[PDB]
Design a protein around this ligand. Structure first.
Ligand SMILES: NCC[C@H](O)C(=O)N[C@@H]1C[C@H](N)[C@@H](O[C@H]2O[C@H](CN)CC[C@H]2N)[C@H](O)[C@H]1O[C@H]1O[C@H](CO)[C@@H](O)[C@H](N)[C@H]1O
Ligand SMILES: NCC[C@H](O)C(=O)N[C@@H]1C[C@H](N)[C@@H](O[C@H]2O[C@H](CN)CC[C@H]2N)[C@H](O)[C@H]1O[C@H]1O[C@H](CO)[C@@H](O)[C@H](N)[C@H]1O
Ligand SMILES: [Mg+2]
Ligand SMILES: [Mg+2]
Ligand SMILES: [Mg+2]
Ligand SMILES: [Mg+2]
Ligand SMILES: [Mg+2]
Ligand SMILES: [Mg+2]
Ligand SMILES: [Mg+2]
Ligand SMILES: [Mg+2]
Ligand SMILES: [Mg+2]
Ligand SMILES: [Mg+2]
Ligand SMILES: [Mg+2]
Ligand SMILES: [Mg+2]
Ligand SMILES: [Mg+2]
Ligand SMILES: [Mg+2]
Ligand SMILES: [Mg+2]
Ligand SMILES: [Mg+2]
Ligand SMILES: [Mg+2]
Ligand SMILES: [Mg+2]
Ligand SMILES: [Mg+2]
Ligand SMILES: [Mg+2]
Ligand SMILES: [Mg+2]
Ligand SMILES: [Mg+2]
Ligand SMILES: [Mg+2]
Ligand SMILES: [Mg+2]
Ligand SMILES: [Mg+2]
Ligand SMILES: [Mg+2]
Ligand SMILES: [Mg+2]
Ligand SMILES: [Mg+2]
Ligand SMILES: [Mg+2]
Ligand SMILES: [Mg+2]
Ligand SMILES: [Mg+2]
Ligand SMILES: [Mg+2]
Ligand SMILES: [Mg+2]
Ligand SMILES: [Mg+2]
Ligand SMILES: [Mg+2]
Ligand SMILES: [Mg+2]
Ligand SMILES: [Mg+2]
Ligand SMILES: [Mg+2]
Ligand SMILES: [Mg+2]
Ligand SMILES: [Mg+2]
Ligand SMILES: [Mg+2]
Ligand SMILES: [Mg+2]
Ligand SMILES: [Mg+2]
Ligand SMILES: [Mg+2]
Ligand SMILES: [Mg+2]
Ligand SMILES: [Mg+2]
Ligand SMILES: [Mg+2]
Ligand SMILES: [Mg+2]
Ligand SMILES: [Mg+2]
Ligand SMILES: [Mg+2]
Ligand SMILES: [Mg+2]
Ligand SMILES: [Mg+2]
Ligand SMILES: [Mg+2]
Ligand SMILES: [Mg+2]
Ligand SMILES: [Mg+2]
Ligand SMILES: [Mg+2]
Ligand SMILES: [Mg+2]
Ligand SMILES: [Mg+2]
Ligand SMILES: [Mg+2]
Ligand SMILES: [Mg+2]
Ligand SMILES: [Mg+2]
Ligand SMILES: [Mg+2]
Lengths: 93, 46, 271
RNA sequence: AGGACCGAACCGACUAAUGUUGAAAAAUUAGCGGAUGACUUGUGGCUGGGGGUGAAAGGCCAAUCAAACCGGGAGAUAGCU
RNA sequence: GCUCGCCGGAAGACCAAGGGUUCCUGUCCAACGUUAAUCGGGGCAGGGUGAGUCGACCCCUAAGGCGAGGCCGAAAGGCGUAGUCGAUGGGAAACAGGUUAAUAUUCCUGUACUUGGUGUUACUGCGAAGGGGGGACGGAGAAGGCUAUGUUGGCCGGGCGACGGUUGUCCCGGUUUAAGCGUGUAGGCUGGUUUUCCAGGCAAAUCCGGAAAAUCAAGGCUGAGGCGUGAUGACGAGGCACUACGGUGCUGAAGCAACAAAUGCCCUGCUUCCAGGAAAAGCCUCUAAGCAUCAGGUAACAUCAAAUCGUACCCCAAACCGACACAGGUGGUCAGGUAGAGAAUACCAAGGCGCUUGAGAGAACUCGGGUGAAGGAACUAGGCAAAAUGGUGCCGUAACUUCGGGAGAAGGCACGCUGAUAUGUAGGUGAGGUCCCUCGCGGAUGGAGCUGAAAUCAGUCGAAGAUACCAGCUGGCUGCAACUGUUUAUUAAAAACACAGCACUGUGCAAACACGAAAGUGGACGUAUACGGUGUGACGCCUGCCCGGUGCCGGAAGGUUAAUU
């Protein structure tokens, strides 16, 4: 049993993009920025508990951060985890 | 024309990596020297 | 037999091979097989300590019975087999209790022959007895030097030792080298010579044939530079030196043995 | 069968020309040798400097080798310029 | 956009290594790009990488590393046992179709499979750090059976041609479908079953090994492909309509056969040879202690679980190694057509490119090529370079020889196309049909259809038929090295080195010898038919005299002679 504190820390935000919108409109898949150390089980539990929707499956990828330049100085943005959460055909999250 | 540098990350790490340096007493001296100099990169590990 | 190869190529012109139709043509006995990897002549420091070693065919080690300790139990020679690890052939033998072993095949040994070990064994080839029980003047092989240690002398193909004398707890043996040695009469020996006496009649014929056996080329010292060998140097073909080893010791006639620990067992040196 | 023969891949490098502030700090073009073997190649490992390794040319050991490179003795010494 | 040219065993496609956002979209043209730039692998912003089955991780080990105690060493340290790491090797499981600007065996649709945990049923002797099996292994060669694949025919849809002809033996295109599940074939291996006993397998064993009988003469293991199902499905020409003209919605006919055929599969097979060809786990099996009406095992069912990390992109290259958007280097996989022995070569397909300065002119001279009167090595250090030869079949072929060679010696003849033999022959394959049976993936007969050399005769065109690309120049004397091989990466490839063979010599095993203050290690899990050093260098005929000098070996009387006292 994953604790509510862990569930509350797991999910960072929703991901807004053309691919995410198409996923939602065609497959009932919500795309979320989640924590790096979040597992599929933790994401499923957090989504079910906090969004009150039933989850079918969770797919996750780690997005590596881009190397950018600011005023001719070199920095790197952080890696982050993206989750594709498939809902159970009638949840409408 | 084959050049003298043929990269391989495994061989790089096994020859000059942090654990390779820490294995021996002279590698730990290399690490101490680089820490004293103030190097931003201690080893080839990263 | 000893067969000459027809000269269909310069590498075949001078090849003489020893072919035994009676050697086993299948795989060896698996339970008695062990792995032995090559070394290249390099010791645990990684340095070349013996020169001209490297490459050759992969070989498996056959666990050969040099002790011959199953006393009183008869064994039948299941078959004769090629051993890559020695110049002699081995014989797979089966004991009356169902144990299989490898021994050196002696001259005349053949499938179906019966062999035995112990004081009560008969005096016939392939039988192992203490040299105290073997009659004097006999030809034996695979002779032990310390009782129970296992045979160490006369183990090459065609080799044998002659029991010359017997004085109390000791037997004097004439060795293949021509040496007379003292060995405890309680040490074991097998009767007969080691088979495969035609092994010395083979001619490799080409350099690749020597390379197949793990031998690497031998560069003469005269062909080196003064920094490489004591023999190196010269504008043309010059020697002007007494021959020496790569490390400076005279190499034509100078004696190198020094063992006062075992000098007492040498009745007479080989000459 | 064969360190067999002819000949691509593959390995090498005998001749000529070009290039020689090069396309290239060793190549290109046309020819050339081996091409089932003492062959060739990937990955990993081991041998360390008066040391290694060398089918031996003082060859090779990171474009460096009759003693690698890096730091130190060190501002060596220089009756020489 | 239309033409033209180039690659096409690549200059196409997919990866590993390496790189790391170079990927896609929008926007800008300062700098970068050897020119311009509206374009870019450039700047900026946004987006993009979805897995129980692919890979890693993971279990198992090789070489090798580290290494509790331990042994050794002034110190630092060296070695190493039990162990533990270490792939480049062994170990469970997914396919087809669809889809994005950018991911897909990951998403969707359809259809699968594997391992484990729990719970319910039944039947039950389970149990390891131990035993056995298996995993599990070389080179070469030969052939058969197949398939990927291609070609042609049949079938279906469309067409009737810018210029003579083209309703035909005419033209174009398509004719595709996986894993899984079932069956069990060509082939390969092996005699099955039972009983009794046993010095072997660190003890037991019903297991493996061995001994002795009885009985049955077909049982078992492995195995490509084919066939059925998967699939009333998917895909499918072109059509019925859209397009913000980059791309999209709906329908969808045929969807077969014969022949040819891999270097891929049966095949870790078979034959043969000597140089005699990993390990450990997973896996099958046997038990010991132990537990023993519990655990545990086997089968069925239901349910749960399969985490984590990689996944974009380049990858023979403008993204990797070369300071460069650099004529260099870089491992694996795929392998269409015509001709061809061919993965050579020429021309093409799919696919990808025209190589990031152009425009003119048409001097000398330089570079790379083409042709050349008469002569033909007169050139030059030297035939350097060039020219020349070049294929197949057949005839023919010398000295010398180690009898294998020399030899493709040398030299010569034929070679296109058309018709006939024979509207396509010999050969290969081989349907329907017939017939039989230990009824199947069967046997015998048969020859339809497909494919198809080579030869002879006759004719015929050209200057020329191996017409292009491709593709030995030949002969004679002689030095050196026997030969194949190796060598101065980057001016020397040789006559140098190596070599098989020969000889001398040391070495009796705790070997000589070598690396090590040592412990240890190699030699070698070898044992004088072995190993080390040295010289010579296939083979044939041989290898003469000298021991005075220097070395080595033996001797041990006498002389001299250290520490010691
Ligand atoms: N609705 C369409 C047209 C129709 O099907 C048709 O024309 N059939 C002819 C029949 C005609 N009989 C065929 O001749 C050939 O075999 C004949 C033997 N039966 C001999 C002559 C030979 N040219 C002709 O090859 C064949 O051509 C057609 O089918 C061929 C089969 O693949 C295709 O290659 C070809 N593309 C296609 O046009
Ligand atoms: N591939 C051509 C290569 C070249 O032209 C060649 O070497 N030719 C040889 C010559 C050589 N001199 C010929 O001996 C023949 O006549 C000799 C006349 N006395 C006698 C021996 C006899 N074998 C030899 O028959 C002949 O072999 C050729 O032809 C053979 C037959 O078709 C083929 O098997 C063989 N593949 C082929 O090489
Ligand atoms: Mg999923
Ligand atoms: Mg993932
Ligand atoms: Mg660096
Ligand atoms: Mg030697
Ligand atoms: Mg030699
Ligand atoms: Mg020598
Ligand atoms: Mg030497
Ligand atoms: Mg020299
Ligand atoms: Mg010297
Ligand atoms: Mg001279
Ligand atoms: Mg050859
Ligand atoms: Mg040749
Ligand atoms: Mg050739
Ligand atoms: Mg050269
Ligand atoms: Mg070339
Ligand atoms: Mg010299
Ligand atoms: Mg160098
Ligand atoms: Mg010096
Ligand atoms: Mg000083
Ligand atoms: Mg100075
Ligand atoms: Mg266009
Ligand atoms: Mg960038
Ligand atoms: Mg782009
Ligand atoms: Mg510009
Ligand atoms: Mg950009
Ligand atoms: Mg310790
Ligand atoms: Mg150690
Ligand atoms: Mg170990
Ligand atoms: Mg392990
Ligand atoms: Mg691996
Ligand atoms: Mg892509
Ligand atoms: Mg087929
Ligand atoms: Mg092949
Ligand atoms: Mg990709
Ligand atoms: Mg460019
Ligand atoms: Mg380039
Ligand atoms: Mg290559
Ligand atoms: Mg080509
Ligand atoms: Mg250009
Ligand atoms: Mg001109
Ligand atoms: Mg000119
Ligand atoms: Mg001109
Ligand atoms: Mg010109
Ligand atoms: Mg000219
Ligand atoms: Mg010309
Ligand atoms: Mg002329
Ligand atoms: Mg003329
Ligand atoms: Mg002439
Ligand atoms: Mg002249
Ligand atoms: Mg002249
Ligand atoms: Mg020439
Ligand atoms: Mg002369
Ligand atoms: Mg030579
Ligand atoms: Mg000779
Ligand atoms: Mg000679
Ligand atoms: Mg070379
Ligand atoms: Mg050179
Ligand atoms: Mg030793
Ligand atoms: Mg000797
Ligand atoms: Mg030697
Ligand atoms: Mg010589
Ligand atoms: Mg002489």
């Amino acid at each position: 049993m994953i604790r509510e504190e862990r569930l509350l820390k797991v999910l960072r935000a929703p991901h807004v993009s053309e691919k995410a919108s198409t996923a939602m409109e065609k497959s009932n898949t919500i795309v979320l920025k989640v924590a790096k150390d979040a597992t599929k089980a933790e994401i499923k539990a957090a989504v079910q508990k906090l969004f009150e929707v039933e989850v079918e499956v969770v797919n996750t990828l780690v997005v590596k951060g881009k190397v950018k330049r600011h005023g001719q100085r070199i920095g790197r943005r952080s890696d982050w985890k993206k989750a594709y959460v498939t809902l159970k055909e009638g949840q409408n999250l | 024309m084959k050049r003298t540098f043929q990269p391989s990350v495994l061989k790089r790490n096994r020859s000059h990596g942090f654990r390779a340096r820490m294995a021996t007493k002279n590698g730990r001296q290399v690490l101490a020297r680089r820490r004293a100099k103030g190097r931003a990169r201690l080893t080839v590990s990263k | 037999a000893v067969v000459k190869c027809k000269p269909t190529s310069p590498g075949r012109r001078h090849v003489v091979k020893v072919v035994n139709p009676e050697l086993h043509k299948g795989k060896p006995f698996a339970p008695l097989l062990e792995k032995n990897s090559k070394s290249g002549g390099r010791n645990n420091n990684g340095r070349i300590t013996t020169r001209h070693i490297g490459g050759g065919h992969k070989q498996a080690y056959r666990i050969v019975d040099f002790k011959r300790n199953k006393d009183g139990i008869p064994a039948v020679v299941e078959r004769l087999e090629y051993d890559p690890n020695r110049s002699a052939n081995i014989a797979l033998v089966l004991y009356k209790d169902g144990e299989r072993r490898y021994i050196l095949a002696p001259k005349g040994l053949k499938a179906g022959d019966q062999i035995q070990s112990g004081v009560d064994a008969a005096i016939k080839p392939g039988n192992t007895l203490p040299m105290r029980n073997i009659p004097v003047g006999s030809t034996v092989h695979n002779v032990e030097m310390k009782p129970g240690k296992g045979g160490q002398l006369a183990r090459s193909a065609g080799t044998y030792v002659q029991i010359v004398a017997r004085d109390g707890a000791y037997v004097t043996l004439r060795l293949r080298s021509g040496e007379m040695r003292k060995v405890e009469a309680d040490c074991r020996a097998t009767l007969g010579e080691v088979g495969n006496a035609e092994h010395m009649l083979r001619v490799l014929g080409k350099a690749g044939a020597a390379r197949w056996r793990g031998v690497r080329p031998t560069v003469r010292g005269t062909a080196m530079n003064p920094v490489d060998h004591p023999h190196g140097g010269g504008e043309g073909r010059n020697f002007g030196k007494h021959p020496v080893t790569p490390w400076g010791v005279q190499t034509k006639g100078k004696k190198t043995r020094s063992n006062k620990r075992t000098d007492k067992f040498i009745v007479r040196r080989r000459s």
